[PDB]
C-alpha cells in the first residue's frame, strides 16, 4: 500500500503538462500501480524459485511482465524496461540517483526495497520494474487525459479513468472488473 502519487504526478506533467488530476482519481491510479507491482513481483519471485535461481534478476522481471501484461502493453513495457536497464548500466560512473541513472521518475530504490521484503534482488531488477510501472502509469495517464480533453475538462476525474480503462481492450483486460 505504498504511495506513488508524487511520481505519478511527475509523469502526468510530462504526458499532459496542462492537465490536472483529482484526489480520488490519483488514489485510483495509485491503487492500479500497487496492484500491478504485486502481480509482477510475485510472479517474478515464483519464476526465480521454480528455476532454482538465488537472485531475482531483470530476466525474471521481464518474463513476469509478459506473463502478467497483455500483448501490446507487454512489448512496450519490455521496451521501456530494457532501455532503462541499458541506460542504468552505462551510467555506473554517474554521481546521480538510481532513478536519474535509469532516466526514470519512479523511485528505483523503493522498488528494490519492496522487492526484497516480500530472496536476493539484482540491481537491474528494480530498474526494470520501476520502468514498467512508470510506463503503465504514463499509458493510463495519456489515455485518461485524452478523455478529459475530449470531454472539455482540464482535470482527470475518476470517470475519465473508467473511460480510458474500458475503451482500451488491453487495459480493460488488465484492470477492468
Amino acid at each position: 500500500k505504498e504511495t506513488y502519487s508524487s511520481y505519478i504526478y511527475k509523469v502526468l506533467k510530462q504526458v499532459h503538462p496542462d492537465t490536472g488530476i483529482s484526489n480520488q482519481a490519483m488514489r485510483i491510479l495509485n491503487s492500479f500501480v500497487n496492484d500491478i507491482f504485486e502481480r509482477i513481483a510475485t510472479e517474478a519471485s515464483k519464476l526465480a524459485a521454480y528455476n532454482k535461481k538465488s537472485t531475482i534478476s531483470s530476466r525474471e522481471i521481464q518474463t513476469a511482465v509478459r506473463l502478467i501484461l497483455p500483448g501490446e502493453l507487454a512489448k512496450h513495457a519490455v521496451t521501456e524496461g530494457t532501455k532503462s536497464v541499458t541506460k542504468y548500466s552505462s551510467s555506473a560512473q554517474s554521481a546521480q540517483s538510481r532513478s536519474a541513472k535509469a532516466g526514470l521518475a519512479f523511485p528505483v530504490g523503493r522498488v528494490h526495497r519492496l522487492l526484497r521484503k516480500g530472496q536476493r534482488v539484482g540491481a537491474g531488477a528494480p530498474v526494470y520494474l520501476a520502468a514498467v510501472l512508470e510506463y503503465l502509469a504514463a499509458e493510463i495517464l495519456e489515455l485518461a487525459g485524452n478523455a478529459a480533453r475530449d470531454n472539455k475538462k482540464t482535470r482527470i476525474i475518476p470517470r475519465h479513468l473508467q473511460l480510458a480503462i474500458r475503451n482500451d481492450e488491453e487495459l480493460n483486460k488488465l484492470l477492468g472488473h
Binding site: 502519487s5 508524487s6 504526478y9 490536472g20 488530476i21 483529482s22 484526489n23 480520488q24 482519481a25 490519483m26 482535470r155 476525474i157 475518476p158
Partner: peptide, 12 residues
C-alpha cells in the same frame, strides 16, 4: 482531501 478536489503534490 475532497474526492473532486485537485490533487496537490505535497513533494517538490
Amino acid at each position: 482531501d475532497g474526492d473532486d478536489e485537485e490533487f496537490v503534490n505535497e513533494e517538490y
